[PDB]
Design a binder for this molecule. Structure first.
Ligand SMILES: [Cl-]
Lengths: 8, 102
């Protein structure tokens, strides 16, 4: 399922 | 016997991040249609803060819920929309955040 993660 | 001390339950802040080349040094998690970070909250939470990065020196911490960035409200925002709001951030980023204790 939908687990989101984004470096910035 | 003894008394509980004064406690700050929750808090809202603004932390001006000065992005030095290489990014903000954080990771965001959550969004409308994604797995919540806290309970069933579909907000944009700070999942990491690379210590000694721009966002660390500014006061950001893990779990801070991202509400607004440079006048752009992240209410009901998807993940990629919060990703794109922070990619055109510029050299100065003023975010509004929300926190819990412990
Ligand atoms: Cl994404």
């Amino acid at each position: 399922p939908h687990t989101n993660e984004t470096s910035l | 016997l003894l008394i509980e001390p004064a406690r700050i339950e929750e808090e809202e802040l603004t932390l001006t991040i000065l992005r030095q080349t290489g990014g903000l040094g954080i990771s965001i998690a959550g969004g409308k249609g994604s797995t919540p970070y806290k309970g069933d909250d579909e907000g944009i939470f700070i999942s990491r803060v690379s210590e000694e990065g721009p966002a660390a020196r500014a006061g950001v911490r893990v779990g801070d819920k991202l509400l607004e960035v440079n006048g752009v409200a992240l209410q009901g925002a998807e993940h990629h929309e919060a990703v794109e709001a922070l990619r055109g951030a510029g050299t100065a980023v003023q975010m509004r955040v929300w926190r819990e204790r412990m």
